[PDB]
Amino acid sequence: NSEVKMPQIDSEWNLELMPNRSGQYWKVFVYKDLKYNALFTRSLGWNGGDGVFTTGLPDGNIFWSFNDSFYGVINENRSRGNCSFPRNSIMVQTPGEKDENLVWLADYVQTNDPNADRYYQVRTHIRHPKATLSDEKIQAGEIDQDYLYWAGDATIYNNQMQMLWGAVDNTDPNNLMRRFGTCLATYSLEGKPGDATYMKLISRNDNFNDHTLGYGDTMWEDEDGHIYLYTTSNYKVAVARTATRDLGSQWEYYVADPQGHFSWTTQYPSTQDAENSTIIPLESACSMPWVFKKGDTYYMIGQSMWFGRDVLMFRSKHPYGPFVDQKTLFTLPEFLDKIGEQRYQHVYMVNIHPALSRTGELVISTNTDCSNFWDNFNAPGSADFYRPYFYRVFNWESLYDNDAPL
């Protein structure tokens, strides 16, 4: 296919084209979204974080969930000051794309005295029942380090958002961040962001799963009435699905027999069996796989293994089917657009945001890390290691131009 679909970029979008790296195809146009990078360059309240998962709502707003995030003050030259580090938090983005539109639904400690301690510091949004810090220590702004919840994907069912929260055990210093269960949280969509009713946790089932595998960390609501729930174990992608569009429906797992024969079973598979049932090639590895459908093709986008900067893409004729023909969509930067040291430790949580897509382009966001935790404070630019950076990929579909069909 000789056609080169030139993308029409509005200057208002504040996109900056990235140079042909090596990893990306010449027909694929990759951009740095400077508008969104600016939206998440904040000084008061949320000013750095992890996770960063969107969910377009039926009222035109977008729901954002975060994992470990800094809530507090950023000083002169993006030098992070006094902050809280809640294990999770949420926000609602309303139409407008100005900071006023990021409605942080935060459990603030205090927002009255800028000269007093705990200014714009926040508490964990949803706490794990096994966490032992006392209600007094939680009121005093202490954050849980033993048992916690981190964001899973979420869907809309009966004008209510059903979300999965993954239970994480950090009591073993060798085996840290051990997934040990899931909680099904139901949120109301009654009112407007800031209301008492809007995005209030209506119900929680903290004993929903006790599963080791994180089925549902990413999701895909398909035309066939099932919500596909994905996970990885040692960079092997396994899939499960809900019986109906209710996230609380009976789950069935796509698991492979010893003869390589796949079939849907209601029994939760062993980790060993879930890894034998990989839905990507056996010669491929990826983490945080995001599946979506465009036309009559299912596309999967994931980060290459061991915190690789290469963003991978696979395709299939089904949301569970053999994901094949790996391609490198693009390579994430080696340096951050930051004050001070631009080099960083890890890039992870390469997430996909259909709700932010203006014309069908992929809207991707990363999470980054610095080796030493103290470097997230008190130095020029320290604020900008631990925050998402946004990208837009136009004409991503081109990757399979000169390949046969499935």
Q: What are residue 376's phi and psi, to 5 degrees?
A: -85, 0
Residue 120 contacts residue 45 (beta carbons within 8 Å): yes
The dihedral region occupied by 266, where left means phi > 0, alpha psi between -120 and 50, and beta the remainder, is alpha
CA distances in angstroms from 213 to 29, 126, 268, 314, listed in the order given: 35, 20, 9, 22
What is the spatial distance between Cα 371 and Cα 5, in angstroms, rounded to a whole number? 41
To one decimal, the resolution in angstroms is: 2.8
Can you list the pairs that 255-259 forms with residues at least 24 positions away whose Cβ atoms lie under 8 Å? none
Strands, E assignment, 190-296? 201-209, 218-221, 227-233, 236-242, 251-256, 262-265, 286-294
Q: Which of 295, 164, 291 is nearest to 239 (CA)?
A: 291
Q: Any idea which residue has 């000083």 for tokens?
A: 75
Token pair 């039926």: residue: 58
Dist. CA 376–CA 380, nearest whole Å = 10
* CA 315/CA 268 separation, integer angstroms: 26
Residue 264's nearest CA partner among 241, 236, 244, 231 is 241
Determine the Cα–Cα distance for residues 121 and 99; give it in Å rounded to an integer.
18
Experimental method: X-ray
> CA 65, CA 91: separation in Å to the nearest integer?
6
Pairing of strands 390-394, 29-33: antiparallel
**φ and ψ at residue 341, rounded to 5 degrees:** -75, 115
215, exposed or middle or buried, with CB in 10 Å at 0-12, 13-18, 19+? buried
**Rounded to 5°, angle at Cα 257 from 251 and 260:** 120
DSSP H or E run through 82: strand 79-84
Structure tokens at 158: 């009966």
Q: CB of 190 within 8 A of CB of 198?
A: yes
Boundaries of every domain in the chain: 1-406
> In the 8-state DSSP scheme, what is residue 138?
H
Distance CA 295, CA 349 (A): 26
Question: 240 with 249: CB under 8 angstroms?
Answer: no
